Enzyme design. Structure first.
Site, PDB file in Angstrom:
ATOM      1  N   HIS A  92       0.745  -1.282   0.024  1.00 31.19           N
ATOM      2  CA  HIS A  92       0.026   0.092   0.235  1.00 31.19           C
ATOM      3  C   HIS A  92       0.815   1.188  -0.012  1.00 31.19           C
ATOM      4  O   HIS A  92       0.572   2.326  -0.694  1.00 31.19           O
ATOM      5  CB  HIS A  92      -0.954   0.096   1.214  1.00 31.19           C
ATOM      6  CG  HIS A  92      -2.210  -0.993   1.252  1.00 31.19           C
ATOM      7  ND1 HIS A  92      -3.534  -0.813   1.586  1.00 31.19           N
ATOM      8  CD2 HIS A  92      -2.180  -2.283   0.843  1.00 31.19           C
ATOM      9  CE1 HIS A  92      -4.171  -1.544   1.315  1.00 31.19           C
ATOM     10  NE2 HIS A  92      -3.415  -2.790   0.986  1.00 31.19           N
ATOM     11  N   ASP A 122      -6.774   4.688   3.751  1.00 35.90           N
ATOM     12  CA  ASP A 122      -7.608   3.445   3.459  1.00 35.90           C
ATOM     13  C   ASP A 122      -8.145   2.824   4.461  1.00 35.90           C
ATOM     14  O   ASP A 122      -9.234   2.692   4.698  1.00 35.90           O
ATOM     15  CB  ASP A 122      -6.559   2.475   2.505  1.00 35.90           C
ATOM     16  CG  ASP A 122      -5.344   2.123   3.035  1.00 35.90           C
ATOM     17  OD1 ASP A 122      -5.018   2.576   4.283  1.00 35.90           O
ATOM     18  OD2 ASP A 122      -4.607   1.862   2.279  1.00 35.90           O
ATOM     19  N   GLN A 162      11.925  -5.984 -12.001  1.00 38.81           N
ATOM     20  CA  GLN A 162      10.910  -6.509 -12.613  1.00 38.81           C
ATOM     21  C   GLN A 162      10.368  -5.781 -13.908  1.00 38.81           C
ATOM     22  O   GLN A 162      10.393  -6.507 -15.062  1.00 38.81           O
ATOM     23  CB  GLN A 162       9.768  -6.946 -11.691  1.00 38.81           C
ATOM     24  CG  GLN A 162       8.791  -7.705 -12.488  1.00 38.81           C
ATOM     25  CD  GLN A 162       7.504  -7.935 -11.302  1.00 38.81           C
ATOM     26  OE1 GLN A 162       7.164  -8.897 -10.798  1.00 38.81           O
ATOM     27  NE2 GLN A 162       6.915  -6.770 -11.295  1.00 38.81           N
TER      28      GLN A 162
END
Length: 452
Positions: free
Chosen positions: A16, A113, A330
């Site tokens: 997050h 959140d 990545q």
């Protein structure tokens, strides 16, 4: 276009913190000032991702000690799953610290959140609140919003909620069991997880998600219909173009393969797999004969990748495959013309990165609500990739089920392989379209400015 001062206050998890920080870079790109609230020791992990140090300022906080938490614990990276609830309690106990910070920094808007108490705090200071959620809006849209007279059952989830824009989503018995038991989960300070999220959804000034109107739009609109309040989209949040260099070990290794022939597999990179599954996965890769690079943590009960590997494995795959337990770039490996396949765990950031490259998509969702829904969205609605199949009741894959999924997408004559590549290409063309990301964010900022 007046400038905003936003404070970013995400849940204590790298999953997050990191998306909040990417979004913070998009907003800072437009002149907006960001106070980024972060656990104090975790800040060192994140500073290098700050691409606007002039505008994005970190605000480090003490994550309070709670009985049961290990020394200096700050985020879900420091504890097993069974202790996430104490991280949530620690976060709840920061409220008085946050109030001080909000009183002195005076941002105009706070993004939050999981802090159900945040909207009352910000409203009491004249500050607006946006519940910025990391999930795909399809996940709360499909999993909530059924008529409530009795407890929700597995059978209930097998149908969409009333008015859901779309047909029923396929859900396996193991996933159904998991989904139903998650509704009862207590998450910090004795609050039901579902109540924690729903209080934030209701008392915020707006809810927001990553996404674009063409894909996430209808689920946002559906949710806005259910709750009667703004549900915004911040844009697809594509990786910024970073003038960087791939590790020479990889630019060499990858360059020694025919283009589009390598299988990159990030499954097991977020959380250690049980030994049975780590082996079936690695044995799964070898059994496809393709070149493969598996970026993953050592399995549970193991300290290295080498001490885990089945005896004989490292020999049999000398040229073909690599099992690498160290940090990888990545985004950049996926940008390599040699990579042709991507096995993803279906986290939201992983999905966006696979979508915007050319590799075929293999979906191996790690058990979780947004993970399962993402894999279904990608594989049965948009049909941009193929899932690895799992046991209907026990939720485990096999070397065979792993092999099939990559053989399907890597067979240029398979009709499902051709289909997922073409739908993938369609979604990639939209996401990289000239105006898409930039007008999404500008529109988002218009809507943010409209909350004042």
């Amino acid at each position: 276009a007046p400038l905003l001062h936003i404070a970013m206050f995400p849940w204590f998890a790298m999953g997050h913190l990191t998306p909040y920080l990417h979004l913070s870079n998009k907003l800072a790109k437009r002149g907006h000032k960001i106070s980024f609230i972060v656990p104090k020791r975790t800040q060192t992990k994140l500073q290098h991702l700050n691409l606007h140090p002039h505008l994005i300022t970190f605000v480090p906080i003490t994550v309070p000690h709670i009985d049961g938490l290990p020394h200096d614990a700050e985020t879900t990276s420091d504890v097993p799953f069974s202790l996430f609830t104490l991280i949530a309690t620690a976060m709840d106990r920061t409220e008085k610290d946050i109030e001080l910070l909000l009183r002195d920094l005076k941002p105009q808007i706070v993004f939050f959140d999981f802090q159900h108490w945040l909207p009352n705090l910000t409203r009491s200071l004249g500050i607006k609140s946006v519940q910025y959620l990391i999930v795909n809006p399809i996940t709360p849209a499909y999993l909530g919003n059924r008529p409530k007279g009795r407890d929700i059952t597995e059978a209930d989830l097998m149908q969409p909620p009333p008015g859901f824009p779309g047909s029923a989503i396929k859900l396996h018995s193991h996933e159904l069991r998991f989904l139903i038991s998650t509704r009862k989960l207590e998450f910090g300070s004795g609050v039901l997880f579902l109540d924690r999220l729903s209080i934030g959804t209701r008392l915020s000034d707006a809810v927001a998600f990553k996404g674009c109107r063409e894909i996430e739009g209808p689920y946002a609109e559906y949710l806005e219909t259910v709750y009667g309040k703004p549900f915004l989209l911040s844009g697809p949040l594509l990786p910024e173009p970073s003038i960087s260099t791939l590790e020479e070990k990889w630019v060499a290794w990858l360059g020694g393969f025919k283009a589009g022939s390598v299988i990159y597999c990030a499954y097991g990179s977020e959380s250690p797999l049980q030994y049975n599954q780590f082996l079936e996965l690695l044995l799964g890769l070898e059994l496809t004969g393709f070149p493969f690079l598996a970026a993953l943590k050592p399995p549970a009960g193991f300290e290295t990748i080498e001490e885990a590997l089945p005896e004989g494995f490292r020999e049999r795959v000398e040229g073909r495959g690599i099992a690498y337990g160290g940090w990888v770039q990545q985004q950049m490996i996926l940008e390599h013309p040699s990579v042709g396949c991507f096995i993803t765990h279906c986290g939201a950031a992983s999905i966006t990165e696979g979508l915007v490259n050319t590799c075929q998509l293999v979906l191996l969702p790690r058990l979780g609500s947004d993970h399962i829904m993402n894999a279904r969205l990608m594989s049965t609605k948009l049909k941009v990739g193929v899932e690895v199949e799992k046991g209907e009741e026990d939720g485990l894959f096999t070397k065979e089920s792993v092999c099939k999924a990559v053989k399907i997408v890597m067979d240029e004559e398979n009709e499902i392989g051709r289909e997922v590549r073409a739908n993938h290409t369609k979604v990639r063309n939209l996401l990289l379209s000239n105006n898409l990301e930039s007008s999404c964010v500008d529109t988002f900022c218009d809507r943010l400015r409209g909350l004042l």
